[PDB]
Amino acid sequence: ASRILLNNGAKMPILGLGTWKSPPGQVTEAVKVAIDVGYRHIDCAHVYQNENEVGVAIQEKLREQVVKREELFIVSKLWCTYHEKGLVKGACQKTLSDLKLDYLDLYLIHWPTGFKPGKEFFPLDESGNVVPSDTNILDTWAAMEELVDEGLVKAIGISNFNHLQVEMILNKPGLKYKPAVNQIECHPYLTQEKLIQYCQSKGIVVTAYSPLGSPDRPWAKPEDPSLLEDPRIKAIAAKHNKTTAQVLIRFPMQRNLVVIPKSVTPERIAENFKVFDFELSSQDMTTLLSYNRNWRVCALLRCTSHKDYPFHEEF
Numbered sequence: 001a002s003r004i005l006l007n008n009g010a011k012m013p014i015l016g017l018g019t020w021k022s023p024p025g026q027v028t029e030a031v032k033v034a035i036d037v038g039y040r041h042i043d044c045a046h047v048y049q050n051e052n053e054v055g056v057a058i059q060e061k062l063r064e065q066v067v068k069r070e071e072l073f074i075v076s077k078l079w080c081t082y083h084e085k086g087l088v089k090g091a092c093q094k095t096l097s098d099l100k101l102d103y104l105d106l107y108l109i110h111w112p113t114g115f116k117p118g119k120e121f122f123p124l125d126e127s128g129n130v131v132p133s134d135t136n137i138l139d140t141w142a143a144m145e146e147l148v149d150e151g152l153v154k155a156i157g158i159s160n161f162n163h164l165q166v167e168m169i170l171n172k173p174g175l176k177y178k179p180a181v182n183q184i185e186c187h188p189y190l191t192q193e194k195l196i197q198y199c200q201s202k203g204i205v206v207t208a209y210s211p212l213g214s215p216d217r218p219w220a221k222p223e224d225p226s227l228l229e230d231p232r233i234k235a236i237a238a239k240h241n242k243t244t245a246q247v248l249i250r251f252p253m254q255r256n257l258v259v260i261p262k263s264v265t266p267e268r269i270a271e272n273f274k275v276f277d278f279e280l281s282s283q284d285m286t287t288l289l290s291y292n293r294n295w296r297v298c299a300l301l302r303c304t305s306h307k308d309y310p311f312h313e314e315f
């Protein structure tokens with residue numbers, strides 16, 4: 001089945017295209033190729049500073065009659081320097097303008113942390129610590145709720161929230177919309193069993209990011225583990241005459257997750273979508289879950305002092 005039901009009654013494609021680190025010089029072609037081979041879900045963010053080039057591609061394929069807007073599922077995220085309630089609408093509208101759209105299918109609070117407002121996406125002090133803003137999760141959520149009530153987004157959710165931060169929102173007095181999705185890092189070295197268990201039990205769909213372990217992450221160190229190069233996983237893939245990446249994409253799919261692998265290479269974009277023609281066995285799944293090391297690609301330690309830093313909690 002290719003789509004999962006959200007709590008807003010809409011259906012979200014379980015396989016989408018990641019765009020973090022896709023250069024503007026290449027992401028337009030990436031998206032065009034993706035849509036041509038079947039992707040309908042694109043994961044975006046204002047902080048990725050390529051939304052205009054993503055919008056170029058969508059506009060194009062709409063104009064070529066390859067797809068209709070209704071068939072697309074476009075995701076973006078509210079960046080940390082816009083968590084003040086008076087800044088959320090503007091941030092959302094900038095993303096809409098850049099993507100040349102009239103609505104987003106899903107809009108996420110990108111991180112639970114608010115940062116000092118300003119042009120700087122990661123404001124630091126003279127010391128190198130990120131400068132927080134005096135905003136909180138609940139007020140920011142209320143602001144996200146207005147975007148639904150105004151017709152700008154069909155659904156709202158969160159990203160990189162721990163189960164206690166998700167809880168705050170759920171128990172929010174006067175809650176208007178429950179979160180639809182929590183997008184979190186998830187892959188065989190960070191299997192997220194507990195948080196997935198919590199979210200799915202609350203009827204919140206989980207999206208797995210960095211499913212290939214983000215080898216292009218700019219802070220990679222050579223000693224870091226490498227999922228795509230893991231011989232144990234290469235062996236699972238060779239058993240199914242599939243590539244390591246296809247295995248890494250198919251894994252979260254069989255855990256009822258959404259997954260959003262990133263590529264700007266047309267061959268790999270196609271390859272990565274060809275994961276609906278095979279099944280990981282029960283042993284394969286068990287084996288892959290067993291590689292958990294609680295290893296995070298995305299956890300900027302310059303944020304570990306923010307009151308809302310998400311990863312001090314077990315989950």
Ligand SMILES: NC(=O)c1ccc[n+]([C@@H]2O[C@H](COP(=O)([O-])OP(=O)(O)OC[C@H]3O[C@@H](n4cnc5c(N)ncnc54)[C@H](OP(=O)(O)O)[C@@H]3O)[C@@H](O)[C@H]2O)c1
Nearest residue numbers: 018019020209210211212213214216245261262263264265
């Ligand atoms: N919510 C947030 O905080 C958050 C954080 C991180 C990521 N995300 C989202 O999740 C998406 C995916 O995560 P990610 O970008 O960190 O990394 P990823 O998808 O785990 O890995 C992308 C890397 O894998 C390479 N690659 C892709 N397909 C491959 C294949 N078949 N064989 C070999 N290498 C392949 C890509 O190369 P090329 O592109 O050069 O082909 C790129 O270097 C993002 O782009 C973003 O949309 C969200």
Ligand SMILES: O=C(O)Cn1ccc(=O)n(Cc2nc3cc(Cl)ccc3s2)c1=O
Nearest residue numbers: 020045111113298299300303308309310
């Ligand atoms: O955010 C994106 O989708 C991609 N991305 C880009 C740059 C980067 O450093 N990170 C790591 C971060 N860690 C935290 C940790 C916290 Cl608490 C807040 C924000 C971030 S950003 C990152 O994930």
